[PDB]
Amino acid sequence: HHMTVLIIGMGNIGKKLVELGNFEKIYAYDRISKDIPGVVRLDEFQVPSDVSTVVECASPEAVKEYSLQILKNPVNYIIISTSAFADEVFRERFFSELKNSPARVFFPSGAIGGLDVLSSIKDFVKNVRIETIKPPKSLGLDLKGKTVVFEGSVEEASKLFPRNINVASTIGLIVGFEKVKVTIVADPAMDHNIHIVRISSAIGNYEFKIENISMLTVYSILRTLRNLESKIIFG
Amino acid sequence: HHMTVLIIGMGNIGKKLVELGNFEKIYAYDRISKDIPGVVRLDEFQVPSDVSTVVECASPEAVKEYSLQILKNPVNYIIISTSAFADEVFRERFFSELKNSPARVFFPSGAIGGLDVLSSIKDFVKNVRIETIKPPKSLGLDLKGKTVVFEGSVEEASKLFPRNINVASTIGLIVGFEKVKVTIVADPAMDHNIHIVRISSAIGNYEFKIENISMLTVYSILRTLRNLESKIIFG
Numbered sequence: 001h002h003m004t005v006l007i008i009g010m011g012n013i014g015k016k017l018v019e020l021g022n023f024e025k026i027y028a029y030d031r032i033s034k035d036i037p038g039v040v041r042l043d044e045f046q047v048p049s050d051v052s053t054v055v056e057c058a059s060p061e062a063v064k065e066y067s068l069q070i071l072k073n074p075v076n077y078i079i080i081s082t083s084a085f086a087d088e089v090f091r092e093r094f095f096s097e098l099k100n101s102p103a104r105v106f107f108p109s110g111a112i113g114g115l116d117v118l119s120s121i122k123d124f125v126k127n128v129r130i131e132t133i134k135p136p137k138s139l140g141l142d143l144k145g146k147t148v149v150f151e152g153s154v155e156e157a158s159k160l161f162p163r164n165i166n167v168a169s170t171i172g173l174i175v176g177f178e179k180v181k182v183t184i185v186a187d188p189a190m191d192h193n194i195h196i197v198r199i200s201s202a203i204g205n206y207e208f209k210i211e212n213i214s215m216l217t218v219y220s221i222l223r224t225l226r227n228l229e230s231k232i233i234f235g
Numbered sequence: 236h237h238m239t240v241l242i243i244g245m246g247n248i249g250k251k252l253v254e255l256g257n258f259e260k261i262y263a264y265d266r267i268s269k270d271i272p273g274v275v276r277l278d279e280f281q282v283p284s285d286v287s288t289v290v291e292c293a294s295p296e297a298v299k300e301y302s303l304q305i306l307k308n309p310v311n312y313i314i315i316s317t318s319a320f321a322d323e324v325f326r327e328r329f330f331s332e333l334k335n336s337p338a339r340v341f342f343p344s345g346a347i348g349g350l351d352v353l354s355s356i357k358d359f360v361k362n363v364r365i366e367t368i369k370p371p372k373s374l375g376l377d378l379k380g381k382t383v384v385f386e387g388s389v390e391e392a393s394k395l396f397p398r399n400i401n402v403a404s405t406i407g408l409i410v411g412f413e414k415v416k417v418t419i420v421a422d423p424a425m426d427h428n429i430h431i432v433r434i435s436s437a438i439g440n441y442e443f444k445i446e447n448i449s450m451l452t453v454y455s456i457l458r459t460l461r462n463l464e465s466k467i468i469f470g
C-alpha cells in the first residue's frame with residue numbers, strides 16, 4: 001500500500017491496476033469523462049511532487065506527449081505503449097533526455113516473455129523473428145488456410161496495425177530495430193492469438209511461445225512495481 | 236566500474252565475471268589455491284564493510300554455508316546455486332532470516348529464460364514441466380533411441396544429479412516446488428543440451444525452449460548487476 005503513483009490512461013489496464021494494486025494515493029489522467037472511482041482525477045496533465053512512480057497504459061501518442069515532462073521528475077517511469085519508439089526521431093529524443101534525467105525507466109515484458117534472456121545477451125543477438133498468429137475472425141477474414149497478412153519491420157507493422165506491435169517494439173528497444181522481423185499470420189485453425197519469439201544469437205538459440213487466454217500485461221506491471229521495494233527479485 | 240563486490244567461487248563463472256565485469260574492487264573467496272589475479276583473495280570468509288553486492292557462483296553447499304552471515308549485511312545478494320533451496324529446512328530458514336535482513340536477494344534466470352513471465356503470474360500457475368534433453372554421450376550412454384533417465388520432483392533430481400537441477404529449483408522458488416515436474420532425457424539425435432520449460436496457468440500457457448551453445452548465466456548475472464544502477468530496465 002506504500003507508494004503514491006500517477007497512472008496515465010484509465011482503460012482496461014489502468015482500471016485493473018487500480019483494482020488489483022495497493023496504493024496509498026492514485027493520480028490519474030485520462031481524456032475520458034468516466035466517473036472516477038478510487039483516484040484523484042487530474043484535469044491538467046502534470047506530475048504531482050509526491051508521485052514516486054508514473055505508469056503509462058494509455059497509448060503510443062501519450063508516450064510521445066508526456067515523456068519529455070515526466071523525465072524531468074525523479075520518478076520510476078513504466079512504459080507499455082512501446083510502439084511509440086518505432087519512431088526514430090522520438091526514440092533518439094527520448095533517450096537523449098534520459099541521460100540528463102533524474103528518472104528511471106522500466107519496460108516490463110508485457111504480453112510476452114523471455115525478455116530476461118534477451119536483455120542479458122542483447123549484444124550477441126543476430127536476429128529476432130516474432131510471429132503473431134491470429135484467428136481470421138479477428139481480422140474479419142474468412143480463410144480455408146493459414147495466410148501471411150504482413151511481413152516486415154516493426155516500424156512498418158506499427159503503421160499498418162496501430163493497435164499491436166508493442167511487443168515487437170520492446171524487443172526492438174533491446175536488440176536494435178534492424179534485427180527484428182515481424183510476421184503476422186491469420187490461421188483458421190486458431191481459436192486465439194499466439195506469439196512465437198525466435199532468437200538467434202552467438203550465445204545460443206531461444207524460442208518463447210506465448211498463448212495468453214491483456215491480463216499478463218497487468219501482472220507484468222504489478223511485478224515491476226512490486227520489485228521496486230521487494231527483497232526477493234526473480235528474472 | 237562503480238561498486239565493490241564479493242565473489243564467492245572463482246571457477247568458470249567467477250573468473251568470467253572478473254574478466255568481463257568492471258569493478259573498482261573485488262574480494263573473492265574460494266577454497267582453491269589458484270594464484271589470484273585482479274582480486275583481493277580472502278583467507279577467511281567474511282563480508283567486508285565496503286562490499287555493496289555479494290555474488291555466489293560456487294556451489295549449493297556454499298549457499299547453505301554463508302547465507303546466514305551474508306544476510307546480516309546490507310548488500311545485494313545474487314544467488315545461482317539455487318538447487319540448495321530444494322532443501323525444505325534450509326529454504327524455510329533462509330527466507331525466515333531474510334524478513335529480518337537489511338539485504339536484498341536476486342535470483343537471476345541463469346541458464347534459462349521466461350522467468351519474467353513466470354514470476355509475474357506465479358500465483359496462477361497450475362504446473363510447470365521442465366525437460367532437459369542431453370546427448371547420451373554426456374551421460375556415458377550408448378542409445379539407439381531417446382530414453383527417459385529421470386522423472387520426478389526437483390528435490391529427487393537434485394539428489395541424483397547434484398550437478399544440474401538449479402534452473403528447476405529457481406522455478407520452484409517462484410511457483411512452489413510441488414508444481415514443478417522435471418524430466419531428463421538422453422537423445423542420440425542431439426548434439427547439445429536443450430531445456431524446454433512448459434507452463435500451464437489460468438492466465439495462459441507458455442513454452443520457453445533454451446538451446447545454449449554457461450555463458451548465458453554469466454551474462455544473466457552481469458545484467459542483474461547492471462540493473463542495480465541502470466536508468467533503463469528491461470524484463
Ligand SMILES: NC(=O)c1ccc[n+]([C@@H]2O[C@H](COP(=O)([O-])OP(=O)(O)OC[C@H]3O[C@@H](n4cnc5c(N)ncnc54)[C@H](O)[C@@H]3O)[C@@H](O)[C@H]2O)c1
Pocket residue numbers: 008009010011012013014029030031032057058059060061062065080081082109110111112163164166167214217
Ligand atoms: N507492451 C505490451 O505488451 C502491451 C499489452 C497490452 C496493451 N498495451 C498498450 O497499453 C495501452 C493501454 O492499453 P488498454 O488495453 O488499457 O487500452 P484502452 O483503450 O482500453 O485504454 C486506454 C486509455 O488511455 C486513454 N488515453 C489515450 N491516449 C491518452 C492520452 N494521450 N492522454 C491521456 N489519456 C489517454 C484512453 O482515453 C483510454 O481510456 C495501449 O496503447 C496498448 O496498445 C501494451
Ligand SMILES: NC(=O)c1ccc[n+]([C@@H]2O[C@H](COP(=O)([O-])OP(=O)(O)OC[C@H]3O[C@@H](n4cnc5c(N)ncnc54)[C@H](O)[C@@H]3O)[C@@H](O)[C@H]2O)c1
Pocket residue numbers: 243244245246247248249264265266267292293294295296297300315316317344345346347398399401402449452
Ligand atoms: N542457476 C543456473 O542456471 C546455473 C548455471 C550454471 C552454473 N550454476 C551453478 O553455479 C555454481 C558455479 O558454477 P561454475 O560452473 O562456475 O563451477 P566451477 O566448479 O567451475 O567453480 C566453482 C568454484 O566454487 C568453489 N567453491 C565451491 N564450494 C565453495 C565453498 N563452499 N566456499 C568457497 N568456494 C567454493 C570451487 O572451489 C570452484 O573453484 C555451481 O554450483 C553451478 O551448479 C547455476
